[PDB]
Design a protein around this ligand. Sequence first.
Ligand code: CLA
Ligand code: CLA
Ligand code: CLA
Ligand code: CLA
Ligand code: CLA
Ligand code: HEC
Ligand SMILES: CC1=C(/C=C/C(C)=C/C=C/C(C)=C/C=C/C=C(C)/C=C/C=C(C)/C=C/C2=C(C)CCCC2(C)C)C(C)(C)CCC1
Ligand SMILES: CC1=C(/C=C/C(C)=C/C=C/C(C)=C/C=C/C=C(C)/C=C/C=C(C)/C=C/C2=C(C)CCCC2(C)C)C(C)(C)CCC1
Ligand SMILES: CC1=C(/C=C/C(C)=C/C=C/C(C)=C/C=C/C=C(C)/C=C/C=C(C)/C=C/C2=C(C)CCCC2(C)C)C(C)(C)CCC1
Ligand SMILES: CCCCCCCCCCCCCCCCCC(=O)O
Lengths: 168, 37, 97, 244, 442, 56, 27, 176, 137
Amino acid sequence: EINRRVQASLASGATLEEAWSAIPEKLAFYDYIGNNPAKGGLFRTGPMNKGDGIAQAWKGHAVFRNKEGEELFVRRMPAFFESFPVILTDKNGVVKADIPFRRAESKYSFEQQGVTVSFYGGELNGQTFTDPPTVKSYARKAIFGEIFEFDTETLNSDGIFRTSPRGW
Amino acid sequence: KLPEAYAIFDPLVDVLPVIPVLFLALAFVWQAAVGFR
Amino acid sequence: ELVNVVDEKLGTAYGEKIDLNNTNIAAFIQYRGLYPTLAKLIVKNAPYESVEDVLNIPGLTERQKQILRENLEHFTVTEVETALVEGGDRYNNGLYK
Amino acid sequence: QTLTYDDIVGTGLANKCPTLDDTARGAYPIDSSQTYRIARLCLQPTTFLVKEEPKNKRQEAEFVPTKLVTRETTSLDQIQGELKVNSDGSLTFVEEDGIDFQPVTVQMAGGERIPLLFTVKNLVASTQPNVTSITTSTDFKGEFNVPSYRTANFLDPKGRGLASGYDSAIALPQAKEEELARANVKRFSLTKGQISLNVAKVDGRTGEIAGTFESEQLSDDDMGAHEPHEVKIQGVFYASIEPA
Amino acid sequence: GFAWWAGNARLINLSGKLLGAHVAHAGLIVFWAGAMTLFELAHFIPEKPMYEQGLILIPHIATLGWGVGPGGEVVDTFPFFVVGVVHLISSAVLGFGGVYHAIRGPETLEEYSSFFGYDWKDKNKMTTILGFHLIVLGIGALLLVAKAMFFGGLYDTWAPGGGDVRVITNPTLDPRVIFGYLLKSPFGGEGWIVSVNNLEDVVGGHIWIGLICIAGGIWHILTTPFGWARRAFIWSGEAYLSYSLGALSMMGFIATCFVWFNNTVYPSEFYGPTGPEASQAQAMTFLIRDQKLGANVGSAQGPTGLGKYLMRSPTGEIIFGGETMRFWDFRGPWLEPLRGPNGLDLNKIKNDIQPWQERRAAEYMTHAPLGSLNSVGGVATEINSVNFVSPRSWLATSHFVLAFFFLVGHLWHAGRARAAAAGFEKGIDRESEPVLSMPSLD
Amino acid sequence: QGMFVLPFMARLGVTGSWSGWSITGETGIDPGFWSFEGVALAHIVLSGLLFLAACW
Amino acid sequence: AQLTMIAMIGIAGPMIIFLLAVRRGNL
Amino acid sequence: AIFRFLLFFQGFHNWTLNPFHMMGVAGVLGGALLCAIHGATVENTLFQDGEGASTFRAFNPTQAEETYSMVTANRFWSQIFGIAFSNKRWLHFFMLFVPVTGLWMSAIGVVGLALNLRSYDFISQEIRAAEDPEFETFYTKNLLLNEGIRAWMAPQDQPHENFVFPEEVLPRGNAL
Amino acid sequence: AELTPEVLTVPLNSEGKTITLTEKQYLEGKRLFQYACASCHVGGITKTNPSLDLRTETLALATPPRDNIEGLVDYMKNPTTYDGEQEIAEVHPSLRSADIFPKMRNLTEKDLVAIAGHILVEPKILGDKWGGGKVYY
Ligand code: CLA
Ligand code: CLA
Ligand code: CLA
Ligand code: CLA
Ligand code: CLA
Ligand code: HEC
Ligand SMILES: CC1=C(/C=C/C(C)=C/C=C/C(C)=C/C=C/C=C(C)/C=C/C=C(C)/C=C/C2=C(C)CCCC2(C)C)C(C)(C)CCC1
Ligand SMILES: CC1=C(/C=C/C(C)=C/C=C/C(C)=C/C=C/C=C(C)/C=C/C=C(C)/C=C/C2=C(C)CCCC2(C)C)C(C)(C)CCC1
Ligand SMILES: CC1=C(/C=C/C(C)=C/C=C/C(C)=C/C=C/C=C(C)/C=C/C=C(C)/C=C/C2=C(C)CCCC2(C)C)C(C)(C)CCC1
Ligand SMILES: CCCCCCCCCCCCCCCCCC(=O)O
């Protein structure tokens, strides 16, 4: 639905910034795995906010590109996986970047492929980041879907996903 | 390989090692023939 | 300020050529004529300030010199990275298949 | 006569350096036209002292004693290297190769374990000017290198490392990472240590020497996780010199 | 009163028929020994190591000096054939006496002849039979001595120049050596009797055992059990069976550890490398490869801070690094030339490693005793291709299983012999239930 | 530090712990059995034996 | 094949029971 | 295929850490214990009711009398183990109770896993380990194994997902 | 899919002559590879030196090129290091060293062609698995 809307905005001559800024934050927040009721644990108690925190703001839609200007796509985490690697694909599914485990024979590091992240909509709209460790930090969040700013201090959130009342 | 002049017996020797097992089986045929008395 | 220096190195020519000062010896198998014999010598005589220093390695025959010449373009040099050269890691970096 | 493996195995003697007779009070003359190597250098620690933390301003903590928990695994041995003669008659040993590190862990009072890489790697140790003979009063002083206790492939218990491993705390997917930066980013340290070797015994015939050493170096910093301790090692050494 | 499924217990007091069972069964053992040897021979291919071919009997014959030359190369297969044929032929004779005594002969012997007949409760007669068999056994251990000293020698993996058959001219008699082994700890670096590492000690140990068994045998013919032994034991056929099952069990467990750790009387040339050997050979292999590329294997620090190739054992000896730290007690002929007084000698490692040692390490590393039940070789994640399970894995696992069950049989027959001798093996008498005449516990 | 029984042990001469510290600040001390730990243990064992005496 | 010999050998044992049971013998 | 299901549940759900599985383990292993120990006891406190060395003949399914001594069995176990059964009815009910209850408990935990409601982690352990790289337990060691299981098996076990893991992203310790 | 002649066609020599093996030659090669080579070279890797494998592209870059029947037959007679600079008959099986590697004694010239052919065919059948190691099992 989000992609459907952004395309419809673009067809009508809106810019990237404008198409994504029109995305209501409420729709973007549904497109986030931390609200997936199948990401919890039996003894991870309390509200969802106790884990990833109290959501404050959509940061914006992250767009990754490599040094040749190709749009790259973070492979999303599936609900079965507690942890998941960071793999970036092109529109056709060909791996073009990842975060390597073994560094020594890596071909696809962000550092080698010149992966940047640019934000449209939300808090970081119009901002681009190019220093590799910042780019990697956002790609790590992008596997969860859309990227939000969270208040972790108020409830002393421990950072681990809990299930919703639907799950419980 | 066996010596040349016994080569004829090669397929017999492939089976010989198993023969002690057959003695165990044979005790159960015997006991079947007397009805496990 | 806390930076992973191995990741940082993949952002240099080390991440696209054989670095004569840092790269593990098994990389020299990617080009013809270099492994094991010249690979051995290149690693033993590192560090190099420029790629052409390798031609001034004592003992090179003229065939050996020729091989290096052909391959100078697959080579680079960056600053020695302690993390890549300690532990004998240029001879065995714990990666097999 | 000397001992075989089967006489030694299991005894503890394999960790002990060769000793000289207390009658070996000779002198080993040095000819500047000649070149010398050290065929075997052996360092056997006896005492591991760690510097405490006074927590206050003008007290400067003290070196305290520790217990060894890693057994007879501590000696450096089979070290070889150039022994040079300099313009001014000083001698400089340059370490080339050897079993020149051992990991050791000692335990401070209270139970804190302190691992260290006891080493002389890349040792360059020199004498005073004008030697001409090595005697029962010659001192070598030098410095050496202390690489990180773990090397770059080492993975911590959550799979994080420098040249391998995860780059984040994957069990805490949505934690704030700023707090964890120091544990998540591994760093490979490389510090210097110092050593004095004091020659107390000399076999003028054979070229063997023996005596006492003291070295100062840093302990393990667990790839940047925590601050090192300062360590002082005392022990005995043996070396045989050869016309190279 | 026994059912068909306990039907051989019907033989306990039929000494004639029981002699026939023992001798018929003796014939099956000898039959298997013969048939199996000929099977291995008909399959043997001398270009291939024995241990790539599933052989367990030919290795025992070669270990005795027959059929082999320097390095364990097979030079003559005729000795193997002879051993098979003679065992095969001899089993017909035992077969014959066996079924004659089980079917046709007198079913009890004590009426026919007071020498051959026996009562289980007759302690004098029982120790006499025991004595005779003790003498036979002593003779047998002396036949091994005779072979080693007077009829060609034994294969010696430690012989210089790759191993060879050697005549043993100075068998060890010093009892501090021979019985020193009995008193070594069974733990690592010690190995109780499994650590015997030279044929002089092997042969001398058998002189001692032969003399002890012959002396023991004569002792038991001439004496009857003392009163303290009379009161310690149960004196019944099933009790004696239970004693021997326990002894077979002990021996099966020892044989398991022998073929698994010992590479002297189970040479690795025939049996394949041991687990410790193979694992030591891996570290050797990559020490060689890496040093040839220029690595300084003595100064190379591994990920943990311990040496990548070389470290110290807990008592200081220089040993191979990695997980094989655990196998540093290993000793083998391909490795010992590198050992100095402090353990592995760094100057021999740098200068004196020989091609045959590089070959041997590579061979042993790629024939480690790891494999699947369907004989796919190597670690459990390996793909199909290599048809190999080490003979040592086969000989260790089989004999562990047999030793375990014979210990169960010991407990079975021991507890039953105790109960039958006291008269309550068939159950509790309702009218004299012991617990009903005991006071309650509380 | 809220220590209540530690000073009654210190008072009568128990000053060191099997972990090698002493309450006076000396490190590397061997207290033998009668450390803080060994005093605590003596009292546990004693409790259990008196528990058994009480049952009898 | 080998299936000839193990057939011949396999039948020996049972044929002994058969002969002895039809000739009413000491089974 | 069922073996693969075992290993899937280890790597993805950490099911061995689940106390509902643990109660199931106790009920199944407790059942087999009770089965063996009850059979062994009856057979070794038999009354001599015939004269044969085979004691099976000396039973008649319509006899009134118990065929083994509960009194002697009770004394044996009281002296061997501290406590024994004394009530034949309780005994046989408990043999029903133990394995039935264990299986019911394991069913409950699987219902949780239907939702990915796993007993996967201990939070307090993770907080410590994230901050303290010298802290290590068998609990952290087992999650490294789980993480290996997931990444090495998921591509071929979940083919509809088109997972492509380049070699460089596979978790691996040194050398292996 | 099947073992078509296209797949059984491999280079004979460096001059791009080809040769089309039979299904028979290929199965014989595979059998002979398991007999004499796979203890070290299972799946196209090298257990005692994993840095050198039997992938066609690796062999192509060996000195004497070994991505052809001739190179491989020669290799089995007189093996060299990967740069051709030294003969390694004494630590690598070969006809030249069949005194110390006795499995090589009974190998005929035709057997060597079949082994070489197997090695060159297999990566056409198995792709990345051939020489790729456990990642690809
Ligand atoms: C159908 C019942 C139900 C459901 C689905 C919910 C759902 C929820 N409650 Mg509510 N609640 C309920 C009943 C329920 N509640 C009742 C009855 C009470 C009164 C006790 C409360 C009191 C309550 C409070 C006070 C709070 C919640 C909160 C919450 C939320 C978090 C729950 C959580 O962390 O679970 C954790 C659950 C577990 C760890 C599972 C317990 C597993 C048990 C112990 C296993 C027992 C096994 C057994 C002993 C074995 C014996 C068998 C055999 C051997 C014989 C969630 C939306 C929290 C919240 O976010 O509110 C704003 C909160 O703070 N609830
Ligand atoms: C020297 C060894 C030895 C000897 C002479 C005996 C002798 C005896 N035993 Mg003891 N037994 C032994 C070892 C031995 N046992 C061991 C090692 C165990 C533990 C496993 C036992 C356990 C045991 C029990 C539990 C009992 C006896 C009993 C008896 C008596 C009757 C046995 C009988 O009729 O079997 C008849 C033979 C059979 C019923 C055949 C059994 C077949 C086995 C289980 C399977 C073997 C299959 C094989 C592994 C592979 C098959 C391949 C396939 C092609 C067929 C007899 C006095 C009985 C007794 O107490 O007598 C008073 C009794 O109840 N034995
Ligand atoms: C090693 C195995 C072994 C051996 C040697 C014996 C031996 C014996 N058993 Mg035991 N038994 C065994 C296994 C064995 N048993 C097993 C596995 C079971 C369980 C099924 C039993 C169950 C059992 C019972 C129930 C009884 C015996 C009895 C007997 C004895 C008398 C049998 C008889 O009258 O045969 C009669 C059988 C025949 C006349 C048929 C022919 C048998 C022959 C010997 C076959 C041999 C063929 C061979 C190829 C010929 C080669 C000859 C050549 C060398 C010249 C005999 C000593 C009996 C006993 O104790 O008597 C009091 C008895 O009642 N056995
Ligand atoms: C230990 C096994 C054993 C035992 C205890 C017996 C015991 C007995 N048998 Mg039996 N028998 C056996 C094995 C055994 N036999 C074998 C293997 C065969 C087939 C060859 C026979 C065939 C047989 C027959 C046909 C008859 C007996 C009879 C007898 C009885 C009297 C024999 C006599 O007068 O001595 C005779 C003494 C001698 C001939 C002295 C010579 C010594 C021997 C033969 C040479 C030494 C052999 C050597 C130690 C081991 C083999 C060598 C090998 C390792 C290479 C006696 C109860 C008789 C009987 O029961 O009638 C009622 C009877 O008619 N036996
Ligand atoms: C098959 C072998 C065998 C068997 C079954 C017997 C059986 C018997 N012997 Mg004979 N004996 C044998 C061989 C054998 N002997 C030999 C070869 C000799 C010559 C040295 C003797 C010398 C001998 C003497 C001198 C005496 C006996 C006596 C006896 C009787 C009592 C045995 C006893 O209670 O020991 C059980 C053992 C003990 C009570 C104590 C010793 C326990 C050992 C040392 C502990 C070791 C356990 C350890 C885990 C095993 C590892 C090895 C160890 C060395 C470290 C019994 C009938 C006695 C008798 O009545 O004779 C008429 C007697 O006085 N035996
Ligand atoms: C271990 C005992 C091996 C056996 C058995 C076989 N090979 Fe091997 N091979 C081995 C090593 C250690 C090496 C590297 C040699 C070096 O340069 O150091 C090799 C190499 C080869 C090659 C060359 C591979 C390349 O990329 O250039 C080939 C073609 C080869 N080996 C083939 C081969 C064959 C056909 C075998 C069976 C007869 C065989 N090898 C056995 C180790 C071992
Ligand atoms: C009693 C009884 C029993 C048992 C039995 C037995 C166990 C028997 C044994 C028997 C036996 C144990 C037998 C044997 C036989 C043998 C034979 C008869 C042999 C022959 C041989 C030959 C003829 C040879 C030939 C040859 C040659 C010479 C060369 C090489 C080749 C060949 C091999 C061909 C039973 C249980 C069943 C039942 C009940 C009763
Ligand atoms: C050959 C050889 C050798 C030698 C050996 C020998 C010399 C041995 C001996 C051994 C022996 C010498 C053995 C021992 C035995 C013993 C035992 C095993 C015992 C047992 C016991 C018992 C069993 C008891 C019991 C009891 C009791 C306790 C109480 C009462 C009751 C009764 C009696 C039951 C050697 C090694 C050098 C080398 C190689 C070869
Ligand atoms: C060496 C030799 C020989 C010898 C031989 C023999 C010695 C044989 C034997 C034989 C035998 C010894 C056989 C037997 C057989 C057996 C069998 C064939 C069996 C079967 C059985 C069955 C099949 C079973 C069934 C059943 C029953 C009966 C009941 C229960 C159930 C059942 C189903 C299990 C000859 C002469 C050839 C010559 C050459 C060489
Ligand atoms: C271990 C090194 C120190 C040696 C310990 C000295 C021996 C034990 C001394 C304990 C003295 C306390 C007893 C006080 C009197 C108690 C009298 C009583 O039981 O009523």
